[PDB]
Design a protein around this nucleic acid. Structure first.
Lengths: 470, 436, 436, 470
RNA sequence: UUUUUUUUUUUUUUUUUUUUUUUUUUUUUUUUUUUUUU
RNA sequence: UUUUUUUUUUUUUUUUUUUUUUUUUUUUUUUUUUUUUU
């Protein structure tokens, strides 16, 4: 059944919106100031810093960074008669802990935490990607497309684990492998057992993320190595560059600004009654009647800022630019010529230059965002009969495809990497930049609610560039 | 004696044909509409839904799917002056239960049920095979050839059990093994005892299906595991890939469209008097003078549709294409380039595009279809030790060994199996593989 | 080096004796009342009930048994002018926890806990053995000799694990096996993982306890069963009846009454300076000048009570009676004709009949008690194949093979193990069997 | 816990007593006629004939015995001004079925059925025992003492199965064995499977009933025979004559007349509140203030009739006469010189001779009736150590009891009967007619309620005869 | 030179027993009565 | 001469995918900034 999931997510987002309402009440902010992305961003880093129970425990025993008992940051932006001023207001965690507890009807609301931290990961992926760490581990900077959910820490649950990219897991596992290579950390102690456990948990997350059997089997065999040394490093680099084309089925969770939920809840649009969804039309129509204000530099233009905000909201920064333009209806400028900077404001930037203005989020169309893969990346081995059965009793040969019959019969010793790299190469050669994917699905219009009739898009606009970076 | 079996099957098919006659009388259909495969198909799903006593009991306690007290589906296709229209006419089970009871002279006619459900399994195997479930259990999609009788549920008897393929049994047993692995279901309760019983019944069906002693012995030893866990999974996968070449002696029951029997019975050809057979010339000669109409899409061609219908009728979709072409006399196109779709029509397809036309079922020759294996097999502690002999037998096996010595393809004019003609194909590598 | 171990055990027993001194100070008992075994026994059950942190946690969530917040029992026996009276004085755990903490110089003193709980196990084995549980698991009552350390719970450490008998481990493992057979308890959850872990810990304790390679290998192979069912039950019963003769190298820890340590510490005999040992002459010479008073029934005789107390102190209740008589110098009466009862007094017994008197602990000789096996062993796919060598070794075994070559019984006057005297018994069949 | 069992049995007997009250209301009987055993006896055969669902199904397809649609018997005895008259009033089952259903608050009350049918078995065992069938199977008439619960049919549950004697099970199993010998009835059909199942159910009931390991093991090995022929017949006869001395732990359920419960319930003594027990003081004190009237022949004396009724009530007809006399306080006459007949009245006996009078049920003492065995029938094998452990390191022999060491080491082939008959004979020879049993337990006085202090009985009255038959 | 882990109710009236356990149906029997007779 | 058993929610939009899944903590990092520098 799907009604229960819809009711649960509706209750969750209703609690989130009511917490936004109460923060607006408590902060004594104006109507316009309640529609600012920066305030929600700072408040949500406060949120994560209050539920980072592991870091809370680590910092209680580590009283450093000067005045840091329980309070961090808090750069609240406020308006005086047109001008803007930032105040470093410090909030302790504990009162906000109870205000959450009262906001979700006595519950912890950790799922909502996962969605906000994923949405921060989405905005981070949209704004800046780290080739710095990608080459710190030595991997080439060609794979920036697989840094989805990179900023997400381990503390997130299965829902958070679903949206993390393959490359994010590759980076996380290489970190552990390098740490275990630097020092003899895999001893029979509890630390070794726990890092072992986290390792197989991350690995079965990985093998769940993939779709074709060959990569699942080679991930299974990578596990066989009880002592991760150097060979597994290139083994999993080969895994990553195979997933470049044999991409994993990674979900795309549609989270929206802290305000958008608050404005919707304040108007009385209860999500429990009519139901809510995270993949369907829902986050699209809530943005159809949502007003958002944002802060812009004197050199920054708002036109690219709105598009980057739409990137962050719908996590479409790693998608084809042409498709995003089609749903937008307007051309989406790649990051090469974006005359804008990061959404977050540096702590040293002055305030006389800063100017607030609206953001455009309206899109002409809407589409479903499933956690599936392309329908043109399944070119491996073969598909058909191997044996025959005699139906008529006729004196005839029984055709047997012998060379594949030996291939099926082996020993299953669960040990090999290059031998499967051979099928990786074969499949890559079979792959083409022409194979059309997602057959049977299309882009839909806003006026339709039950997915009745789509329109098939068709682009012949040469080589405008389907590459957000470079 | 064989006369009694012939008389029994003749009486059964006579009752089936008379039931077809009475449904034609009751439905007020025209002569052409009585020769449509779709009507018989829908009526026979009604048939199975009326004798699915287990599902009847399960659905009486489960009133769901909206308006479903006793009536399901019923998309009857009718002609108005050339055009076609579907009506969703709902029939309850019980009256058709009594009409059967009167159609078989007071008997239940469960054997006929088995043959119709097998014929549905034959058409399903001809049209679509499920690698979906084959990889849901994780088995590779290379073994689509052993999905014979896959759609057949357990309710069929020994006659139904004979025609189910080895791979069908492998899938059914792996389903039970995975269910017993997910939860501790093998307790000393009645459910565990009954699933145990069904397990040995399916297993001695399996060991009866095989021919060589090694696989029979390893199936015997697979039984010795009182707690089916993970090792038996690969054990029986090895059994399956051994049966790929060491094939089991599975029968091929020759059932024909619901109409073909009805037209034959209506003309007065009593099968009890002259006798009837399910393996011999009989279903061949009844199709020699049978007229069949079918529904075809505006893009579908009837030429491949007739060949696919012959596949479904004679269950030759898993055989060599060359042999089927020889009996046909015309080339049989493999499924790779069939510009056609499934025989059954989707519930949402429009009717202005649909067009009805004849089907060709005439074949130049006829052959016996025994439940034997290739002559190549006659020419030739745990499970792994026997896997060793499996491997050496596989190595001894060759793609050259000719089978079925002493038997041949026959002509239509002969009735007593007097003199055959030996076929000989040297036409390179046209492709003896229906899939791929 | 052995000096560090001697210093550690000396410090431990010094702390124990000082705790005895302080309890004597706090309880306001007389000099005679401080030499009573019953008071020390009750105080030491208080000790175990205060460090049973597992049971403390289990009872804090389970407030039952009426008035049981933190206090249990406490039947202190006191003298009025010759007569005796018991008072049910209740002591809470926590203050005694801190008094221990101050008694061991800020340390927990868990090792001392292990030795006191082992000494309770020694007295329990000396007094009463449970064929009740031995036949509750169905094992025959012939193996009462392998119930050493049976009362010891799991909470003890490696030192406690060393002295537990083979049969005690057999009983503990069969309990877990029967619990896992009754319900599907071996799931992938944390409980299954932890019981698994405890299982291999108890099993490598077992295989460490044995000496011959065959039984170690069969214990190794018993481990290979991931699902302990019924076959392992008889497998480990065969292991036990093989250990009947192929006995395991189990230690014998020489703990002494709560008072004996207190009297020695009170007199100023510091054990840290001169060193202390648990296997050598030490516990023998401390009893050479120790006075002990005990409570005796009007029908009980003190002569057998002193011998039973010596059994409990030196854990010689499972040894040959002849040898114990030789070290005693007087005949040791077997349990068949002991006109005495258990040392502990029932909660309902009256006090007018109870009479206090001295106990004799002096022994003419002393001997080393190593954790080795008889020299007879040095003279000599599944479980059944190794059971074959078990049977042939049993047949090779004889009731004549003399053991412990090169070692002998020593005199008290010698301190450095200079010259022993070889004993020799030809006194027919007096009976080398404490039970029966 | 024992409170729940007490509450359940109290509710059950309260329902039984209320059904007795309603039958007294419906039958229009007088106060004296409601204290007659015969009326309750006939009504309770009506009870069993109404819940004998198996026989109901068998007789619906078998309309014989003349007028027998739903009604059987019903010889109700009534008083006219001192004289007595029997009326053959026929009651159908179904209305009494619903009256039960309303009497137990909507429940079937099958447990109460088991207790009434056991109490009928108790009275039958007290009155008449069948050496007729005992020699029909050919077994000697010396074992009449093991016919406890003989009349009980299979339909009773575990509670009914507990009180059936060892000899009753022997007779029931020999019946099945002779039936399977007469015809090839053990085929692979459903009938063979079901009789097989009933066979192991009766056999594990048997092995649960015994106490010593040898007989349990030989019962286990008797099971090994898949085809019960002739050898098992003498095998289980040997089992029976071994159980003659190695008696099985068979319970003694204390059921009382149909009226006694009704009179107690009518007076308002609710058993749910104060609790009820079936083994303790309870059935004793209810008889301390119970009045019972009974029918007696002109030649029968009431003095022996009261004692026989006490036999039937407390199922002490198979016990020592001396002990029963001690609890009675008066001498109990053995069946050899009882100038009385069966309690039930023959259908042809005239009514002018029949006379009604009181029955004495008062007993001077009370005792617990546990389902245990004698503490002097445990003389088998030996008890003591077999091995020794070296405590001191002394150069000495290790005494091993070798001939028993071989005895323990065998093969466990689960096949033998005479070899264990050898230990049967050895144990029988070790057994003595002097061994005192039931140590630590004694006879109690009525005034005590919590089992405080007993008095030890002691009989030196020569050989009065501890044998009810003969 | 070898070591403090916790998972839903037990035990000191005492020394080898005693203890939260259950409605299945297959071809003709039985209340003249208590150990024979069919 | 070889045979009608029933156990808690599936399937005809279509031909080889798509679907009721979850808060763990171990010795010093990061919002001056967007792909280097430590």
């Amino acid at each position: 059944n799907a009604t229960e999931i819809r009711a649960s997510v509706g209750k969750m987002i209703d609690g989130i919106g009511r917490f936004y309402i109460q923060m607006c009440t408590e902060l004594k902010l104006s109507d316009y100031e309640g529609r600012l992305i920066q305030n929600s961003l700072t408040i949500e880093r406060m949120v994560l810093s209050a539920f980072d129970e592991r870091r809370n425990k680590y910092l209680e025993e580590h009283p450093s960074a000067g005045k840091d008992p329980k309070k961090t940051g808090g750069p609240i932006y406020r308006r005086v008669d047109g001008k803007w001023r930032r105040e470093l207001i410090l909030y302790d965690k504990e009162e906000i802990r109870r205000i959450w507890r009262q906001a979700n009807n006595g519950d912890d609301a950790t799922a909502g935490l996962t969605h906000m931290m994923i949405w921060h990961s989405n905005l981070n992926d949209a704004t800046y990607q780290r080739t710095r760490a990608l080459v710190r581990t030595g991997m080439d900077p060609r794979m920036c497309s697989l840094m989805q959910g990179s900023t997400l820490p381990r503390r997130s649950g299965a829902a958070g684990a679903a949206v993390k990219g393959v490359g994010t897991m590759v980076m996380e596992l290489i970190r552990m492998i390098k740490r275990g290579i630097n020092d003899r950390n895999f001893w029979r102690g509890e630390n070794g057992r726990r890092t072992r456990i986290a390792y197989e948990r991350m690995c079965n997350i990985l093998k769940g993320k993939f779709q074709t059997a060959a990569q699942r089997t080679m991930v299974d065999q990578v596990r066989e190595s009880r002592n991760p040394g150097n060979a597994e490093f290139e083994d999993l680099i080969f895994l990553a560059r195979s997933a470049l084309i044999l991409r994993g089925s990674v979900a795309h969770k549609s989270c929206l600004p802290a305000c958008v939920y608050g404005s919707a809840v304040a108007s009385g649009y209860d999500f429990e009654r009519e139901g809510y969804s995270l993949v369907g039309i829902d986050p699209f129509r809530l943005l159809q009647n949502s007003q958002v204000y944002s802060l812009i530099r004197p050199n920054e233009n708002p036109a690219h800022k709105s598009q980057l905000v739409w990137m962050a909201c719908h996590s479409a920064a790693f998608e084809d630019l042409r498709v995003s333009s089609f749903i937008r209806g307007t051309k989406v400028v790649p990051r090469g010529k974006l005359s804008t900077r990061g959404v977050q404001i540096a702590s040293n930037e002055n305030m006389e230059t800063m100017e607030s203005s609206t953001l455009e989020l309206r899109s002409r169309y809407w589409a479903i965002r499933t956690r599936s893969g392309g329908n043109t990346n399944q070119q491996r081995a073969s598909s058909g009969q191997i044996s025959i059965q005699p139906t008529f009793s006729v004196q005839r040969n029984l055709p047997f495809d012998r060379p594949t019959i030996m291939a099926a019969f082996t020993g299953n010793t669960e040990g090999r990497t290059s031998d499967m790299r051979t099928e990786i190469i074969r499949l890559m050669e079979s792959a083409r930049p022409e194979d059309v994917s997602f057959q049977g699905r299309g882009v839909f219009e806003l006026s339709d609610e039950k997915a009745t009739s789509p329109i098939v898009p068709s682009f012949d606009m040469s080589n405008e560039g389907s590459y957000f970076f470079g």
